[PDB]
Design an enzyme around this catalytic site. Structure first.
Site, mmCIF file in Angstrom:
data_model
loop_
_atom_site.group_PDB
_atom_site.id
_atom_site.type_symbol
_atom_site.label_atom_id
_atom_site.label_comp_id
_atom_site.label_asym_id
_atom_site.label_seq_id
_atom_site.Cartn_x
_atom_site.Cartn_y
_atom_site.Cartn_z
ATOM 1 N N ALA A 12 0.825 -1.202 0.000
ATOM 2 C CA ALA A 12 0.000 0.000 0.000
ATOM 3 C C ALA A 12 0.860 1.252 0.000
ATOM 4 C CB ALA A 12 -0.939 -0.005 1.203
ATOM 5 N N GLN A 15 2.666 1.607 -3.456
ATOM 6 C CA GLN A 15 1.723 1.944 -4.515
ATOM 7 C C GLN A 15 1.217 3.375 -4.373
ATOM 8 O OE1 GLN A 15 -0.858 -1.735 -4.267
ATOM 9 N NE2 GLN A 15 -0.563 -1.672 -6.487
ATOM 10 N N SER A 140 0.177 1.049 5.756
ATOM 11 C CA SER A 140 -1.189 0.613 5.996
ATOM 12 C C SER A 140 -1.228 -0.234 7.256
ATOM 13 C CB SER A 140 -1.736 -0.185 4.811
ATOM 14 O OG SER A 140 -0.833 -1.206 4.439
ATOM 15 N N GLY A 143 -1.816 -4.586 6.946
ATOM 16 C CA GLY A 143 -0.757 -5.440 6.406
ATOM 17 C C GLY A 143 0.266 -5.851 7.457
ATOM 18 N N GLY A 144 1.046 -6.894 7.212
ATOM 19 C CA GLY A 144 2.113 -7.302 8.111
ATOM 20 C C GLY A 144 3.327 -6.393 7.991
ATOM 21 N N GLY A 146 3.599 -3.330 6.440
ATOM 22 C CA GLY A 146 3.024 -2.030 6.727
ATOM 23 C C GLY A 146 2.835 -1.787 8.209
ATOM 24 N N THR A 179 -10.089 -6.816 3.258
ATOM 25 C CA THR A 179 -9.543 -7.849 2.390
ATOM 26 C C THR A 179 -8.655 -8.834 3.134
ATOM 27 O OG1 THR A 179 -7.659 -6.469 1.764
ATOM 28 C CG2 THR A 179 -9.658 -6.287 0.441
ATOM 29 N N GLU A 183 -6.805 -8.224 9.953
ATOM 30 C CA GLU A 183 -6.603 -6.769 10.073
ATOM 31 C C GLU A 183 -6.749 -6.193 11.487
ATOM 32 O OE1 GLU A 183 -9.098 -4.855 6.941
ATOM 33 O OE2 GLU A 183 -7.334 -5.014 5.648
ATOM 34 N N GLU A 254 4.814 24.502 12.561
ATOM 35 C CA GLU A 254 3.790 25.376 13.120
ATOM 36 C C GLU A 254 2.401 24.823 12.834
ATOM 37 O OE1 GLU A 254 5.308 28.109 14.566
ATOM 38 O OE2 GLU A 254 3.493 28.890 15.522
HETATM 39 N N1 LIG Z 1 -5.597 2.615 -0.508
HETATM 40 C C1 LIG Z 1 -4.903 1.549 -0.783
HETATM 41 N N2 LIG Z 1 -5.046 0.476 -0.015
HETATM 42 C C2 LIG Z 1 -4.279 -0.575 -0.432
HETATM 43 C C3 LIG Z 1 -3.466 -0.600 -1.544
HETATM 44 N N3 LIG Z 1 -2.889 -1.859 -1.681
HETATM 45 C C4 LIG Z 1 -3.321 -2.519 -0.647
HETATM 46 N N4 LIG Z 1 -4.139 -1.799 0.180
HETATM 47 C C5 LIG Z 1 -4.726 -2.212 1.471
HETATM 48 O O1 LIG Z 1 -3.783 -2.092 2.523
HETATM 49 C C6 LIG Z 1 -3.970 -3.157 3.455
HETATM 50 C C7 LIG Z 1 -2.662 -3.957 3.662
HETATM 51 O O2 LIG Z 1 -2.166 -4.556 2.483
HETATM 52 P P1 LIG Z 1 -0.606 -4.527 2.066
HETATM 53 O O3 LIG Z 1 -0.214 -3.110 1.919
HETATM 54 O O4 LIG Z 1 -0.595 -5.438 0.905
HETATM 55 O O5 LIG Z 1 0.124 -5.225 3.280
HETATM 56 P P2 LIG Z 1 1.707 -5.078 3.385
HETATM 57 O O6 LIG Z 1 1.983 -3.882 4.219
HETATM 58 O O7 LIG Z 1 2.419 -5.149 2.081
HETATM 59 O O8 LIG Z 1 2.084 -6.238 4.402
HETATM 60 P P3 LIG Z 1 2.259 -7.754 3.994
HETATM 61 O O9 LIG Z 1 1.972 -7.965 2.565
HETATM 62 O O10 LIG Z 1 1.271 -8.400 4.895
HETATM 63 O O11 LIG Z 1 3.661 -7.978 4.404
HETATM 64 C C8 LIG Z 1 -5.168 -3.983 2.979
HETATM 65 O O12 LIG Z 1 -6.365 -3.510 3.597
HETATM 66 C C9 LIG Z 1 -5.145 -3.669 1.481
HETATM 67 O O13 LIG Z 1 -6.379 -3.851 0.805
HETATM 68 C C10 LIG Z 1 -3.349 0.590 -2.336
HETATM 69 O O14 LIG Z 1 -2.675 0.814 -3.340
HETATM 70 N N5 LIG Z 1 -4.090 1.635 -1.854
#
Ligand SMILES: Nc1nc2c(ncn2[C@@H]2O[C@H](COP(=O)(O)OP(=O)(O)OP(=O)(O)O)[C@@H](O)[C@H]2O)c(=O)[nH]1
Ligand SMILES: Nc1nc2c(ncn2[C@@H]2O[C@H](COP(=O)(O)OP(=O)(O)OP(=O)(O)O)[C@@H](O)[C@H]2O)c(=O)[nH]1
Ligand SMILES: [Mg+2]
Ligand SMILES: [Mg+2]
Ligand SMILES: [Zn+2]
Lengths: 439, 72, 426
Positions: A12, A15, A140, A143-144, A146, A179, A183, A254
């Protein structure tokens, strides 16, 4: 004027970072190879880019990013995509295997092998800075990588630098849309670390941005490129005053000390106003008053809670473009006079205002209209507490019978850490409800 | 290191079998618990875990399903 | 990087693995000789997951093919895509197990387990970092279910940190032509609970029903049943082979779906199953896929989820898809079928989306659902076992080759415990 380092963590974060950098380079007129054609620049020099790029290569701009993931795949997409030529490869960090949605992997078992490398890369980027403003962390909570690796990285940053600000653009689990099964464990286990080791967390949830894509942009089938574009516009607006001159500009440091009334009460709800369908933009005059009024409607908030269930502690409005300061005062007066918009009575002013001369730019793709005025609201409200209560309720439903806990404990976590992160969340709930009391 | 804790947790509740249920060590991390070479982990507070089935279990909780004299 | 090694045990294992290598090489566009003739670099970007690079632009699959009897080696080698495996992974016996678990576990399989471990080792250091083993086998006899499970005991004994996947074809009451299947299945599931990270139960009766009333084939051969399980095997592992908008992984599916270590038995389904004619009378749409995956007729096990409660679900989609569609369809299913999902888990679905779909289709999905519906199949197997065991029928065949009456009793108590532990969640 000064410079800050952005860290994109996990899929996340990476991206979102792609869109954020596609927006910055296009806003500063920098091409995907890192070159920038010599413009007129009457006066000599262009310091707009210094905030986010280093000039090294006699006409070559390299962004102040770190991309990190325990997983190769999305970093290899960046090494292959249109912007593969911006980043010098040593800053695109990568692990061997992912945390796989497990916090204890990305914190304890697997993150500890990659932290020693990202810390070196940020110590190397910060020494290149003449003066550091802060750290922009994109991640995020669900995610693990994240959740766990960013939590670990925040304590490392707090130890190494201490007083440098750390903005945190975190994707939060949505109320119903989710997803991943697990979570709530990952999102309670960040919470201690985002309380203690962060200055401003702009949590944003995906079902709120899906509603913005449906209601405002008329997009029937939105995908993460559209959502990530909306976060990129928020982040660009927050740092606009640091890159361009404005009639009333606000510094990042500030800006926090205005908006954060207490050391723990640090979780602003983000928003962006002139976000409307490229055809319906013909039928709207799009002046200051109506884009101010857009910021206070529940349908425009980037988190699925409605402010009418609480009180604002503070707002700030980061206007940019063709905004005259006399109109802003009238709009603020109208907002204060208007009912159903509640501010806690012990903040008389309740607003910080920032005005910048640079209008927002639109990337190719047709998701957005070219508009001469924009505002990013971000606002601190006891309404945010409902998002965390509905999530801590999901955590309890599972933890009441240890529903996945063996995957976390087996990855080197004591089961007392779940109860500690849970009672910490509850204490933050009590802190946000007690400041909901008018004195 | 963990060899002391793996020994301790195996026989603070004594083995009551007519031949003692095995918990020998071959080397570090490789314990032949009940004629089977498990993989053993700990990190902090001496919580001790075994890599089994679909995931992980506590070393005491494992014996509580695998030595007949721990059942009764 | 992130490699997998594939193991085939028994005729069922061998025949499924053959069709599996067929569909894999079709996906990556690999010449039956071993050359590449595709048109995309994304295939080369992860060709190393299932293949090893050889001199002359040749790829050899990372597979081993094993059983105690040499007839299926000749068939698989002389058959289609036969001359792609390096003729050293084929490690075959000479007697066979004769549908008897004793031969698989003690007398004949034990004398061949060294020769297979020495090849699994040789494959294990040829990779950057493998993350798991896939075993393809039947629970019908020693062959797959006793030899191919002594194999997972030894593999776990030396590679404990890695993931074990087994695509176990479980026996069914209405299909069998072995009379000893209740003994072999009960002995196999006794150790499969300890030695596996996740187990996909398939039975041939469901794959026949899917051919009869979904594909509209009146004479479905094993070549046709094997297509469905190979498409499931490709679907569950397609995330680490192609870029996707949301990513799964074998370890990802393990932690999202195994709530307690014992509860790792899964039932697959595959979504765009259609007859060659009726395909033009239907939409290529995510709502249709998602409803099909939850249909009790479409599950690859004879148990229907209707009598049980879903604990966890995974849905790995393949194609140019939008997450908002998947998210609303998942909420649609979970809300109006709320009686069919467990209450003490709020979110039961885990989602993954891959941008490269199967050949010939625009969209597909593989469903994996952990549910308390799986234990009724185990109750039928235990009822068939205890009917024969009380008379000690066929017991001499196993007794005279290593087991005592104690081992059968231990297996039946521990499979009774597995059904007791699954029904604990209603
Ligand atoms: N807004 C947004 N949410 C996203 C995106 N890609 C994934 N997510 C969400 O972010 C959350 C965590 O997913 P990831 O970011 O794949 O998890 P990660 O941090 O890569 O961790 P692991 O894959 O578990 O090691 C989930 O709820 C996803 O659906 C993106 O591009 N944008
Ligand atoms: N789905 C599927 N099931 C098969 C196939 N071939 C056989 N089976 C099933 O698995 C059983 C075959 O036993 P196996 O253990 O696979 O191999 P084997 O070589 O016959 O084993 P032994 O002769 O007993 O040593 C049959 O009774 C069927 O139940 C096949 O291609 N696909
Ligand atoms: Mg990655
Ligand atoms: Mg055979
Ligand atoms: Zn004992």
């Amino acid at each position: 004027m000064r410079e800050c380092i952005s860290i994109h963590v996990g899929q996340a974060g990476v991206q979102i970072g792609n869109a954020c950098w596609e927006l910055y380079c296009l806003e500063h007129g920098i091409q995907p190879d890192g070159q920038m054609p010599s413009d007129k620049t009457i006066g000599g020099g262009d310091d707009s880019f210094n905030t986010f790029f280093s000039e090294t290569g006699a006409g070559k701009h390299v962004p102040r990013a770190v991309f990190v993931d325990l997983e190769p795949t999305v970093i290899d997409e960046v090494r292959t995509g249109t912007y593969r030529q911006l980043f010098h490869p040593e800053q695109l960090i990568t692990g061997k295997e992912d945390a796989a949605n497990n916090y204890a992997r990305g914190h304890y078992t697997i993150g500890k092998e990659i932290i020693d490398l990202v810390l070196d890369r940020i110590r190397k980027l910060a020494d290149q800075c003449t003066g550091l403003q802060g750290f922009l962390v994109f991640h995020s909570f669900g995610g693990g990588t994240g959740s766990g690796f960013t939590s670990l990285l925040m304590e490392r940053l707090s130890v190494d630098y201490g007083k440098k600000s750390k903005l945190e653009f975190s994707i939060y689990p949505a109320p119903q849309v989710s997803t991943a099964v697990v979570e709530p464990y990952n999102s309670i286990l960040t919470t201690h670390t985002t309380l203690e080791h962060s200055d401003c967390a702009f949590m944003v949830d995906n079902e709120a941005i899906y509603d913005i894509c449906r209601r405002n942009l008329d997009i029937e089938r939105p995908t993460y490129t559209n959502l990530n574009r909306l976060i990129s516009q928020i982040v660009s607006s927050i740092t606009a005053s640091l890159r361009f001159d404005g009639a009333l500009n606000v510094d990042l440091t500030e800006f926090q000390t205005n908006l954060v009334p207490y050391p723990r009460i640090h979780f602003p709800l983000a928003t962006y106003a002139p976000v409307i369908s490229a055809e319906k933009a013909y039928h709207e005059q799009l002046s200051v008053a109506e884009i101010t009024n857009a910021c206070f409607e529940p349908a425009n908030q980037m988190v699925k809670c409605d402010p009418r269930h609480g009180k604002y502690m503070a707002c700030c409005l980061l206007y940019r473009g063709d905004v005259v300061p006399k109109d802003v005062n009238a709009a603020i007066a109208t907002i204060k006079t208007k009912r159903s918009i509640q501010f806690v009575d012990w903040c008389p002013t309740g607003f910080k205002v920032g005005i910048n001369y640079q209008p927002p730019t639109v990337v190719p793709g047709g998701d957005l209209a070219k508009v001469q005025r924009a505002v990013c609201m971000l606002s601190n409200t006891t309404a945010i507490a409902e998002a965390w209560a509905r999530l801590d309720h999901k955590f309890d439903l599972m933890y009441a019978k240890r529903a996945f806990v063996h995957w976390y404990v087996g990855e080197g976590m004591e089961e007392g850490e779940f109860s500690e992160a849970r009672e910490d969340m509850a204490a933050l709930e009590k802190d946000y409800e007690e400041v909901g009391v008018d004195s | 290191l963990l060899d002391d804790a793996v020994k301790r947790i195996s026989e603070d509740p004594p083995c009551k079998c007519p031949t003692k249920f095995c918990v020998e060590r071959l080397s570090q991390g490789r314990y032949r618990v009940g004629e089977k070479i498990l993989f053993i982990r700990m990190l902090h507070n001496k919580h001790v875990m075994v890599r089994v089935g679909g995931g992980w279990e506590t070393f005491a909780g494992y014996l509580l399903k695998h030595d007949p004299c721990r059942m009764l | 990087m992130r490699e997998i090694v594939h193991i085939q045990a028994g005729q069922c294992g061998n025949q499924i693995g053959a069709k599996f290598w067929e569909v894999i090489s079709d996906e990556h566009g690999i010449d039956p000789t071993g050359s590449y003739h595709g048109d995309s670099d994304l295939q080369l970007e992860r060709i190393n997951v299932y293949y090893n690079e050889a001199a002359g632009n040749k790829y050899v699959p990372r597979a081993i093919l094993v059983d105690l009897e040499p007839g299926t080696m000749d068939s698989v080698r002389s058959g289609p895509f036969g001359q792609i495996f390096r003729p050293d992974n084929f490690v075959f016996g000479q007697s066979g197990a004769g549908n008897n678990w004793a031969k698989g576990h003690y007398t004949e399989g034990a004398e061949l387990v060294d020769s297979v471990l020495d090849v699994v080792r040789k494959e294990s250091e040829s990779c950057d970092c493998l993350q798991g083993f896939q075993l393809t086998h039947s629970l019908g006899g020693g062959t797959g279910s006793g030899m191919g499970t002594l194999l997972i005991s030894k593999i776990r004994e030396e590679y404990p940190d890695r993931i074990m996947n087994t695509f176990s074809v479980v026996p069914s009451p209405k299909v069998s032509d072995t009379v000893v299947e209740p003994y072999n299945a009960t002995l196999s599931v006794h150790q499969l609970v300890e030695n596996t990270d996740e187990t996909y139960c398939i039975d041939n009766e469901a794959l026949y029903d899917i051919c009869f009333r979904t594909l509209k084939l009146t004479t479905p051969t094993y070549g046709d049943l094997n297509h469905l399980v190979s498409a499931t095997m490709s679907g569950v592992t397609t995330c680490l082979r192609f870029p996707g908008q949301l990513n799964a992984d074998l370890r990802k599916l393990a932690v999202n779906m195994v709530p307690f270590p014992r509860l790792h038995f899964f039932m697959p389904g595959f979504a765009p199953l259609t007859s060659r004619g009726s395909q033009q009378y239907r939409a290529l749409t995510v709502p249709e896929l998602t409803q099909q995956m939850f249909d009790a007729k479409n599950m690859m096990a004879a148990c229907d989820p209707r009598h049980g409660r879903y604990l966890t679900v995974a849905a790995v989609f393949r194609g140019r898809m939008s997450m908002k569609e998947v998210d609303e369809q998942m909420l649609n299913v979970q809300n109006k079928n709320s009686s069919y999902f467990v209450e003490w888990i709020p979110n039961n679905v885990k989602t993954a989306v891959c941008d490269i779909p199967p050949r010939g289709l625009k969209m597909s999905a593989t469903f994996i659902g952990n549910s308390t519906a799986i234990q009724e199949l185990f109750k039928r197997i235990s009822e068939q076992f205890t009917a024969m065991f009380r008379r000690k029928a066929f017991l001499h065949w196993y007794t005279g080759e290593g087991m005592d009456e104690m081992e059968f009793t231990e297996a039946e108590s521990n499979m009774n415990d597995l059904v007791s532990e699954y029904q604990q969640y209603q």
